[PDB]
Amino acid sequence: TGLELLYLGIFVAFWACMVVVGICYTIFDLGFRFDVAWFLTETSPFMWSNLGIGLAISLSVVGAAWGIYITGSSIIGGGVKAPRIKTKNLVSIIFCEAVAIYGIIMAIVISNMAEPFSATEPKAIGHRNYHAGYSMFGAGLTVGLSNLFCGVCVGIVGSGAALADAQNPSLFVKILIVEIFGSAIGLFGVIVAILQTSRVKMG
Amino acid sequence: NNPEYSSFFGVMGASSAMVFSAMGAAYGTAKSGTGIAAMSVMRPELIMKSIIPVVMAGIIAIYGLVVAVLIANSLTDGITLYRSFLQLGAGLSVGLSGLAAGFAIGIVGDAGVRGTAQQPRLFVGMILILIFAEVLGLYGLIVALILSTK
Amino acid sequence: NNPEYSSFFGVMGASSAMVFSAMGAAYGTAKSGTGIAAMSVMRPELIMKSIIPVVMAGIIAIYGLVVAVLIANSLTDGITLYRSFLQLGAGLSVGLSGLAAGFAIGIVGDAGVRGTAQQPRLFVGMILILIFAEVLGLYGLIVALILSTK
Amino acid sequence: NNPEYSSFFGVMGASSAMVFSAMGAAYGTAKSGTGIAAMSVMRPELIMKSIIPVVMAGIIAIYGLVVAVLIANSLTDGITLYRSFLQLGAGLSVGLSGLAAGFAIGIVGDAGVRGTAQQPRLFVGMILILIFAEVLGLYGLIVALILSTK
Amino acid sequence: NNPEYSSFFGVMGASSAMVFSAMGAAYGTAKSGTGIAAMSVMRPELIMKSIIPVVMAGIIAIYGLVVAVLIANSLTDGITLYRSFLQLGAGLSVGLSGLAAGFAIGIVGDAGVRGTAQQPRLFVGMILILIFAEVLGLYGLIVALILSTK
Amino acid sequence: NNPEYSSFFGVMGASSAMVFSAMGAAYGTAKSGTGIAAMSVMRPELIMKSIIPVVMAGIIAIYGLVVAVLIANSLTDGITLYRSFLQLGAGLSVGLSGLAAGFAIGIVGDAGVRGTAQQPRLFVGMILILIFAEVLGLYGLIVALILSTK
Amino acid sequence: NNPEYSSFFGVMGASSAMVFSAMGAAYGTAKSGTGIAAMSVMRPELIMKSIIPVVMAGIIAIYGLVVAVLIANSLTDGITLYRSFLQLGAGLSVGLSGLAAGFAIGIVGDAGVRGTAQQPRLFVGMILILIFAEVLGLYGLIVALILSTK
Amino acid sequence: NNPEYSSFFGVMGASSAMVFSAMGAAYGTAKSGTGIAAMSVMRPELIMKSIIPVVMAGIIAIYGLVVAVLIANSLTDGITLYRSFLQLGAGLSVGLSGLAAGFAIGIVGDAGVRGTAQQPRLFVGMILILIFAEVLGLYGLIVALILSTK
Amino acid sequence: NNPEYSSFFGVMGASSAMVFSAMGAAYGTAKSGTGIAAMSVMRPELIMKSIIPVVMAGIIAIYGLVVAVLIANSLTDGITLYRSFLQLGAGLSVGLSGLAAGFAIGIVGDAGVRGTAQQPRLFVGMILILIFAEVLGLYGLIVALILSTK
Amino acid sequence: NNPEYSSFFGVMGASSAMVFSAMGAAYGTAKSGTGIAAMSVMRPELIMKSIIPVVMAGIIAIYGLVVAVLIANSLTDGITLYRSFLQLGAGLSVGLSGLAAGFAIGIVGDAGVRGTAQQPRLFVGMILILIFAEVLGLYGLIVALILSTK
Amino acid sequence: PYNLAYKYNLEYSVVFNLVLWIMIGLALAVIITSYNIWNMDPGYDSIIYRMT
Amino acid sequence: HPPVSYNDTAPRILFWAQNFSVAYKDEWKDLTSLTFGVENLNLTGSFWNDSFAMLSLTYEPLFGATVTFKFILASRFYPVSARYWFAMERLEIHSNGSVAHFNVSQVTGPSIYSFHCEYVSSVSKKGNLLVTNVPSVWQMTLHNFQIQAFNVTGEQFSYASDCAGFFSPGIWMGLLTTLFMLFIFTYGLHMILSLKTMDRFDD
């Protein structure tokens, strides 16, 4: 159980160092050496586009995989004596690949707008692209984690559904309704993403 | 004029508006669904009675989503950077308050599972406790609406 | 004269207020509500008698909201950069004081629920202790009422 | 000449003061209430002679708030960066002192209550512990007021 | 014109591509080997069948290797900072997708191998969940192949 | 010539002094008093005599409080940037020494009242061990006064 | 004209390639050897049968050596900061590929050794599963060699 | 020519010199003190003669105290910016040396009083083993007397 | 023209060469030391035959020390910053390899020592794995010597 | 031309030379003595043999003095800043070698003296295995003296 | 002194980054190894049974 | 060395440099000797006004060409920080009437405090200070320069402000990418460390 201790130590040291540096800078009235414009103007929007795409597919992949194994373990446990479970519970793994497609299609939506800049000086060059590629990043991480947790909930709910279906298969749809709700939350995520990528333009 | 990069606050406003709220929603639904799977094992007649926490986790998702859609509608390039502060604050507020209401409705919900499993009478009381949590979610909503349109 | 980012502190003030108070109320409905679902299995007659800690968590939510909106309507673009500090500190204070009364209420109510189950005479004291917790909530509100208008 | 971060520091002083005081008082009330809920069953008659540590956590809250509001009322914009130092130090000192005092009150109150569930004579020594809990609270108060006057 | 340090993003992308997919394939082999070792004592006639997820974990490693070698071919010194970024995104995405597919394959493999140990009827379903996991891995490959040319 | 940032150190030393020593006392009494209740369960006649470590815990907090008041007396806006230094050094030193002392008080006093109410002869040896802890705190007090005077 | 400190990243690549694979071998042999000491003790007729994981860990160590030596013997001062980064990526790639392969072969070897203690039929399939992880390490070596000569 | 903020190197040296040794002495009194508290039950006659490791942890703390007072005696604002660094090193060294010596003395003396209680013959051997730790603390003193006078 | 602060590489390089190897050495006498203690407890006649892994730990100490002194004696103040960096890399590689060898030799020595007592046929295999650990150390040594004269 | 307070790497080296060694020898005595307290329960005649590992544990502390005093004497102000680095390296090397020797001596002397408390024959192997720990500490001192004189 | 600079080194940021990275890496390695070697288990069996 | 100064009614412009040189025919006319120690320099064209200033350091006509250097100094207010910030943006070299223009690098800072970056130069690597094309055969450098030309209260410079700050912008995104990579890698390592063997078998 030392790994969580290592993580706690890392986080504590990081946070304490940040606090100490911040209070020291405020104390000595340093002349905007903590320049936000320096942190930001030196940021390529290609980060924003590429990491939006990457997070959008990655988090969806992770959640869909999580639901996949959770349902797999549950169905395999429940089918020991009730093999009629597999007649019905595969809809959960279909929902997991739905969790995947929600992110993949939006990754394509972001990737359609991959363009160059041919601009070097940050000040007042590419003012629109700056907000555009950023917004691609925001929408990408949004839809990614959206599909992620949607897959998580669908999976563990399908686990409960399968272990209930072991003793009686008639109530499976009565349990599947909550999976429909989880899918709806994932759709909310996709909608926020499209509203964040409908007024953007690159290069 | 508008300082460059000013819209970033508003876009994290939209993200943080919906993200944590949806965490909470899918947590509440998840866990109440497992408890109600146990219910489905032990008796089927209260299945209509078991839909209560889930739709309200959906309500948490709405609390997040309406604000997020508002921000994603107000997005643009040349933002004053003084409305976007309100956008960001509203977003993080409504998001994490949706997370709050989310795990609250979840834990109270699966407590209510067994509580109503053995005693049908406690159904009314546990609904009351549930309603309190979505009042908390609406609280999470309203300041976000105030700030995002201030 | 006042530099950019001056309005920034106040909105996190209002936010953090409502954030931490929401956490407190969520934990108040967390522990005590599950305690009800565990206790009232054998004593359904006190279903109406132990809603008090839950409504008290609601009151913590009210405190948070009141200070949050108070800061929300009192903020501006051309702020002196001192009022922003006052609002930030006030909001942080009241929020986490709501959180404070939150876990106090949660633990106290969870103990008092089955304490009333075993010995019904515990009801004389349980709400008194909850009143102490809400006194701490009022303490937070007092500091918020001084700092914000300062 | 007079900075704004001086006012920031003073406000955070008052904040941290009431913050940590509320933490201590809420924790103390939580542990004390659990102790009373444990003892109440076999000793139903001492429900009226058990509120004392809760009142004394209240006293720690008195200290926290009086310092917090006193520092709050002394806030201004024309600060020479010195009274701000005194205010910040005072506030954080009284705050964490109240936190530690409330922690001690909670643990000692729970333990003494559980001991008194069969030993009525332990009441006297329990008060003897309570007085030194308040001594720690008073020591939180003292230097903080001294600094608020420096 | 060509920004300095332009080359390290894409090589690290190809690294991550072969790294995390290799972790996934290691996960598959690790868990499925514990499976087969536990199993064949009772029913040694199904050893050939239990290699189904192992070849598929190897195929995840092939996905990662394919992307890594492609990016290795396409790198250069005179990068306008764009191609290297595309390579970075593609490589990291395929790597993490290989990791996910490999872990799912591994633990589903051990579980369904046990399911075949007792009930032979679960074997086709085991292959079912495995093919879905492999479809996930193939998504991981294909989107990265798109990104390296976008 | 000394900048305006030359008294942070003194104002934080005055805090540190009581602060960590008060953490020490809140450990000392916290563990000891729990021991006192636990062994008042067994024989009540030693409830009075058992209060020694708690008075002693108060003395541990005296060590920090008095020095802190001395720092407050010697604190000024126009400090040399070298007396503020000694104030910080002395304050944090006496604080940490008091923390160590009170930790020892908690553990030793609890175990000592255990083994003393069990075996009455330890009413000598327990107190003998106790006085060492105060002597250890006095080490810190000596150097703290020396630094305050250097 | 070349950037300063350019060649250093390739040498760190060699060091990582070496050390990570060294960790992999040191673990792959260790747990397998404990399996041998626990299995052969009562079925010593399979001592020569179960040295394959040890040879495989040796193969991983040889991969580490060859890559590290190849990078170390290609070093120079006049690098354009573009060869060194590729060498770093190659080195990390092969090193951690050997690490994961070492873990996989060790655990699978112990599992299969005990399994063939119970059931001689495993032996060939066990070897096959070992081939899988070794070939994962080989894939890592492929990408590393493509990068090293790039 | 002496850089600003130079004396703290010495001041924090003197601070650590006794404080870390005081942590050690706290452990020293804690462990062996608890052990003697346990061992009074069966052999009340050994209570007085078991004080030895506690006295010795006393001297362990005297080491750090002596260094801390010495550095204060040699303390000055007009430092050459080298002697203060020697004081820093000396204080850090002696303080943590006392820390380790006191911890080891506490646990070894605790076990030694266990052993002497179960068998009187251990009384002299354990004493010698404790002398060893005292000599280690004395070496920690020695280096710090060389450096803080250099 | 040589950049200053170059020797941070080599001075740390010799140290790191011996640091991790020293940790591995302390590990190699550890676990096999306990195993040999147990197996001379049960039977003293094979006490002499059980010392080989301790000699192997000594050999790993040789592997660390030879490179350590080779880096030390290959030092100066005006280094060209290239060779010094190479010495750092060599030290890290050899130290980490020696640490791996220490882990392997300790664990396997204990396992094989506890094994050979029951089944004598395990002794030869134990020796073989000891050779493999030495070969790991030699791999590290090879890369270190390559980097010492590149 | 020498940068400021240039000796401080070497002064921290003089510290680290005995810091980690004080930790190490303390560890070694820490477990050894607790072992001895148990050994002399059933064979008090081995109170003489109990002293064997501890006199040799003292040598770690001797080594901590060896370089520490040397550099406490040979230090100066006008240092070229590179010998200062060398001394830092030497100090940390001998110190962590003290940790290594302390760890090994503690655990191995512990286990071996158990196995001597049971089987007298184990004594020879106890001493023999003990050899290598001081060999390790010697290696540390070797590198430390080379760096302190190179 | 006319506030003449002390010649803050050019590209001191890169040197600072590299030294920070190497120091934290060595610290991580030594600390994890220390944690490892601290929690060794001598077996808690054989004669250790007799000594409980 | 005594720094050169605008020693009219009140010193308002300060400038130092350990060296200063220019190579016209690819060999460096060392101009350090003519500055920081030479009593009389032609400073007729220098001009002073608040937030509005110029310089003109004319020298002898060495290598058959009259030499002159001209610097523009100004400071623009910014409400975002409520401070004046001075920046250097153009240098002219008048040789025999013809003018050679050199847009200046990111030499900037607050008007309150001075600016020091050790080396600054047109010749690449040594510094940057380049401009569109400009294929002239004139390269210049400034060993240990310094400048303080706003709110100057005396011959003493103001507090120096480093150009390097605390970070090199060329590697911040790289640092962030490495952070994300190691985050996912430690996730994977935390997952793989939960693995463990199998206990005794079933029959």
Q: How far is F117 from chain D (nearest CA, A)?
A: 14
Assess C39–B contact: CB distance below 8 Å, yes or no.
no
In residues, how long is chain D? 150
Rounded distance between C-alpha atoms, residue L58 and residue L42, angstroms: 5
Q: Is L4 on the interface with K (CB under 8 A)?
A: no
Q: Which residues of C touch B108 (CB under 8 A)?
A: 29-30, 33-34, 37
Local structure of F145: helix, strand or coil: helix
Q: How crowded is residue H145: how many other Cβ atoms within 10 Å of its Cβ?
A: 16
Give the span between the Cα atoms of I110 and I95, in whole angstroms: 23
Contacts of K20 (CB under 8 A, 6+ apart): none
Cα L9 to chain center, whole Å?
28
| CB–CB contact C40 B81 (8 Å) | no
Q: Which residues contact I83 (CB under 8 A, 6 or more apart)?
A: I10, I74
Q: 3-state DSSP call for residue L19?
A: coil
Which residues of J fall within a CB distance of 8 Å from I30? 103-104, 107-108
User: Are chains D and L in touch, 3+ Cβ pairs below 8 Å?
Assistant: no
Q: Give Cβ neighbours of residue E114 (< 8 Å, ≥ 6 apart).
A: A76, E35, E38, E39
| Alpha helical stretches, state H, chain B | 8-42, 52-74, 83-118, 122-149
Q: Could you give the CA distance from residue I104 to residue G28 in angstroms, rounded to a whole number?
A: 10
CA B108 to chain centre: 15
**C98: which 2 tokens?**
């709501």
Query: Tokens in use for B144?
Result: 């976000």
Q: How far is CA L160 from CA A36, A37, C11, L112, L117, in A?
A: 21, 21, 36, 10, 9
Residue written as token pair 């590729």: G86
Q: How far apart are CA C106 and CA D119, in angstroms?
A: 29
> Do the chains contact at K29 and I42, CB–CB below 8 Å?
no
B110/B38 Cα distance (integer angstroms): 10
Which subunits sit against B, judged by 3+ Cβ pairs under 8 A?
A, C
Q: Give yes or no for a contact between L130 and L4, defined as CB atoms under 8 angstroms apart.
A: no
Cβ contacts below 8 Å, chain H against chain J, sum to: 139
Complete DSSP assignment for chain K:
-TT----PPTTHHHHHHHHHHHHHHHHHHHHHHHHHHHT----S-THHHHH-
Tokens, residue E34: 């514990």
Q: Tell the residue number behind the tokens 């250790």, with chain if given.
A: K48
C-alpha separations of D34 from A154, B44, D39, I108, L72 in Å: 38, 38, 9, 52, 76
K30, K42, K48: residue with CB nearest J107: K42
Gap from L201 CA to chain E (nearest CA, Å): 6
Contacts of B30 in chain A (CB under 8 A): 152-153, 156-157, 182
Q: Is the dihedral of CA F35, F38, F43, F44 positive or negative?
A: positive
Q: In whole angstroms, what is the distance from residue E29 CA to residue G108 CA?
A: 8
Do residues A112 and A197 lie in contact, with contact meaning Cβ atoms separated by under 8 Å? no
Q: Are H30 and F107 in contact (CB under 8 A)?
A: yes
Residues 6+ apart with CB under 8 A from E52: E109, E126, E127, E130
Question: How many residue pairs bridge chain G and chain L with CB atoms within 8 Å of each other?
Answer: 14
Distance CA L5, CA L116 (A): 16
Chain E residue nearest residue A67, CA to CA: E104
Is there contact between F and D if contact means ≥3 C-beta pairs under 8 Å? yes
**How many other CB atoms sit within 10 Å of the CB of residue B3?**
13
Q: What is the CA radius of gyration of chain L?
A: 26
SS3 content of chain L, % helix, strand, coil (to 5): 15, 35, 50
Number of Cβ within 10 Å of residue L198's Cβ equals 16
Pairing verdict, β L28-30 and L53-58:
unpaired
**Yes or no, beta carbons of D139 and F55 under 8 Å apart:** no
Using DSSP bridges, classify how beta strands L53-58 and L21-23 pair: parallel, antiparallel or unpaired.
Answer: unpaired
L115 phi/psi in degrees, rounded to 5: -135, 125
Residue C3 DSSP label: P
- Residue C67 CA to residue B143 CA, distance in Å, equals 11
Whether L140 and L105 have beta carbons less than 8 Å apart is answered as no
Calculate the CA J56 to chain-centre distance.
10
- Helices E83-118, L172-193: axis angle to 10 degrees equals 10
DSSP code, position D51: -
DSSP D44: G
Q: At what angle do helices I122-148 and I83-118 cross, to 10 degrees?
A: 180
CB-CB contact of C104 with D26 (8 Å): yes
> Residues with Cβ < 8 Å from K1, sequence gap 6 or more?
none
- What are the DSSP calls for C64-130, one per residue? HHHHHHHHHHT--SS--SSHHHHHHHHHHHHHHHHHHHHHHHHHHHHHHHHHHHH-GGGHHHHHHHH
| Cα of F15 vs its chain's centroid, Å | 14
Q: Is L90 helix (H, G, I), strand (E, B) or coil?
A: strand
In the three-class reduction of DSSP (H, G, I as helix; E, B as strand; rest coil), residue J68 is classed as helix
Distance from CA of A140 to the nearest CA of B (A): 10
**Alpha-carbon dihedral A164, A166, A167, A172, rounded to 10 degrees:** 50
CB F4 within 8 A of CB D81: yes
Identity of the residue in A157, A179, A188 whose CB atom sits nearest the CB atom of B65? A188
Contact in structure between H9 and H87 (CB atoms under 8 Å) = yes
**DSSP codes joined into one string, A23-53:** HHHHHHT-SSSS-HHHHHHT--HHHHHHHHH
Sheet arrangement for strand L120-121: L28-30, L21-23, L139-142, L120-121
Q: Which of I143, I145, I148, I150 to mutate to test the interface with G (most CBs of G within 10 A)?
A: I143
Contact predicate E44/G116, CB 8 Å: no
Tokens of B106: 């979840």
Packing angle of the helix pair C8-39, B122-149 (nearest 10 deg): 180
DSSP L91-119: EEEEETTEEEEEEEEEEEEETTS-BB-S-
**Pair type for strands L98-110 and L120-121:** unpaired
What tokens were used for A76? 């395999």
Please give the residue of chain J at the shortest CA–CA distance from K38. J103
Q: How many CB atoms lie within 10 A of CB K2?
A: 14
- Stretch (H or E) spanning L71: strand L68-78
- Distance between CA atoms of residues L166 and K16, nearest Å: 9
Residue of I16, I19, I30 with shortest CB distance to K40: I30
Which of A127, A141, A168 comes nearest B15 by C-beta? A141
State the smallest CA–CA distance between residue F128 and chain A in angstroms.
38
Nearest to L192 by CA among A77, A62, I107, E29: E29
Tell me the structure's resolution in angstroms, rounded to a single decimal: 4.3
Alpha-carbon separation of residue B130 from C104, G1, G127, J81 (angstroms): 20, 70, 58, 69
Contact (CB<8Å) J115/K34? no
Q: How far apart are CA C83 and CA C75, in angstroms?
A: 9
Query: Half-sphere exposure of A184 toward its Cβ, with a 13 Å CA cutoff?
Result: 17
Quote the tokens at residue F27. Answer: 């450990």
CA distances from I141 to G59, I65, I68 (A): 17, 10, 11
Contacts 24+ apart (CB under 8 A), L46-54: L46/L6, L46/L8, L46/L13, L48/L6, L48/L8, L48/L12, L48/L13, L51/L75, L51/L76, L51/L84, L51/L150, L53/L12, L53/L13, L53/L149
Instruction: Quote the DSSP letter at residue A198.
Output: S
Using the Cα atoms of residue D34, residue D39, residue D44 and residue D50 in order, give the sign of their dihedral: negative
Distance from CA of G99 to the nearest CA of E (A): 10
SS (H, E, C) chain H: CCCCCCCHHHHHHHHHHHHHHHHHHHHHHHHHHHHHHHHCCCCHHHCCHHHHHHHHHHHHHHHHHHHHHHHHHCCCCCCCCCHHHHHHHHHHHHHHHHHHHHHHHHHHHHHHHHHHHHCCCHHHHHHHHHHHHHHHHHHHHHHHHHHHHC
Put simply, the answer to whether F97 touches H19 (Cβ < 8 Å) is: yes
Nearest to A164 among B41, B51, B64 (CB): B41
DSSP three-state, residue L24: coil
CB J2 within 8 A of CB J79: yes
**What is the sign, positive or negative, of the torsion defined by CA atoms of A118, A122, A123, A126?**
positive
**Strand order through the sheet with L98-110:** L53-58, L68-78, L83-95, L98-110
CB-CB under 8 Å, K30 with J96: yes
Inter-chain touch A3–L110, beta carbons under 8 Å: no
For residue A120, count other CB atoms closer than 10 A to its CB: 8
Instruction: For residue L105, give the amino acid letter.
Output: S
**Measured distance CA(D71)–CA(D86) in Å, rounded:** 10
Flag if I107 and G51 touch (Cβ within 8 Å): no
Bridge partners, L139 (sequence order): L23
F101:H26 CB<8 A: yes
Q: Would an 8 Å CB–CB cutoff place I137 in contact with chain G?
A: no
**Chain E closest-CA separation from residue G89 CA (Å):** 6
Q: Looking at chain B, which residue has its C-alpha nearest residue A150?
A: B26
Instruction: Tell me G3's DSSP state.
Output: P
Q: What is the DSSP letter of I78?
A: S
The answer to whether K47 contacts J118, with C-beta atoms less than 8 Å apart, is: yes
J8 at the H interface (CB within 8 A)?
Answer: yes
Answer for the pair A151, A63: CB distance below 8 angstroms, yes or no.
yes
Question: In terms of Cα–Cα distance, which of D62, D57, D49 is closest to D25?
Answer: D57
Q: Which of L4, L16, L36, L116 to substitute to test the interface with K, most K CBs within 10 Å?
A: L116
Tell me which of E16, E18, E48, E52 to substitute to probe the interface with G (most G C-beta atoms closer than 10 Å): E18
**Chain G residues lying within 8 Å of I112, measured CB to CB:** 33, 37
- The widest CA-to-CA distance across chain H, in whole angstroms, is 68
CA distance E130 to B147: 49
CB B75 within 8 A of CB B14: yes
Residues 121-180 of L with CB under 8 A from E: 170-171, 174, 177-178, 180
Phi, psi of L91 (to 5 degrees): -130, 135
Residue of A nearest to L108 (CA): A31
The answer, yes or no, to whether J and K have at least 3 beta-carbon pairs within 8 Å is: yes
Interface test with D, best of C39, C84, C128, C150 (most D CBs within 10 A): C150
* Residue I67 sits at the chain J interface (C-beta within 8 Å): no
- Closest to A198 in 3D by CA, of E121, B69, B143: B69
The rounded distance, in Å, linking the Cα atoms of G18 and G35 is 26
Asked whether the beta carbons of residue C111 and residue D36 sit closer than 8 angstroms, the reply is yes
J135 sits in which H/E element? helix J122-149
Q: Report the distance separating Cα A175 and Cα A179, nearest Å.
A: 8
Query: In the 8-state DSSP scheme, what is residue L140?
Result: E
Which residues make Cβ contacts (< 8 Å) with residue L10, sequence separation at least 6? none
Burial level of A193, CB count in 10 A (0-12/13-18/19+)? Answer: buried
The runs of H, that is alpha helices, within I1-150 are: 8-28, 31-42, 52-73, 83-118, 122-148
Handedness of CA G132, G138, G140, G142 (dihedral sign): negative
Both tokens of H150, joined, read 């250099």
B60-85 burial code (b ≥16 CB/10 A, e <16) = bbbbbbbbbbbbbebbebebebbbbb
Task: Tell me whether E36 touches chain G (CB under 8 Å).
Answer: yes
State phi, psi for D119 to the nearest 5 degrees.
-120, 90
Q: Does J15 touch chain H (CB under 8 A)?
A: yes
* Tokens coding L114: 């001075």
What DSSP assignment string belongs to A115-128? --------TTSSHH
Per the document, the length of chain L is 203
User: Within 10 A of E71 (CB to CB), how many other CB atoms are there?
Assistant: 32
In whole angstroms, what is the distance from residue J106 CA to residue A155 CA? Answer: 51
Q: Where are the domains of chain G?
A: 1-150
The answer to whether A161 touches A73, Cβ cutoff 8 Å, is: no
Amino acid of residue F30:
A
CB-based contacts of D70: which residues, under 8 Å, 6+ apart?
D145, D148
Nearest CA to CA, how far is B51 from chain C (Å)? Answer: 18
Least Cα separation, residue A97 to chain E (angstroms): 8
Dihedral of the CA atoms D31, D37, D42, D47 (nearest 10)?
90
Report the C-alpha gap between D57 and C101 in whole angstroms: 13
Q: For the packed helices F52-74 and F8-40, what is the interaxial angle rounded to 10 degrees?
A: 170
How far apart CA G138 and CA G101 sit, in angstroms, is 9
User: Is the minimum CB–CB distance between A106 and chain E shorter than 8 Å?
Assistant: no
Tokens of D144: 């903080």
Cα dihedral I11→I14→I16→I22 (10° resolution): -140
3-class DSSP assignment, residue I79: coil
What are the backbone dihedrals phi and psi of residue E6, each rounded to the nearest 5 degrees, phi first? -80, -15
Tell me which of C4, C8, C15 to substitute to probe the interface with B (most B C-beta atoms closer than 10 Å): C15
The answer to whether residue L181 neighbours chain E at the CB level (below 8 Å) is yes
Cα L187 to chain centroid distance, Å, stands at 44
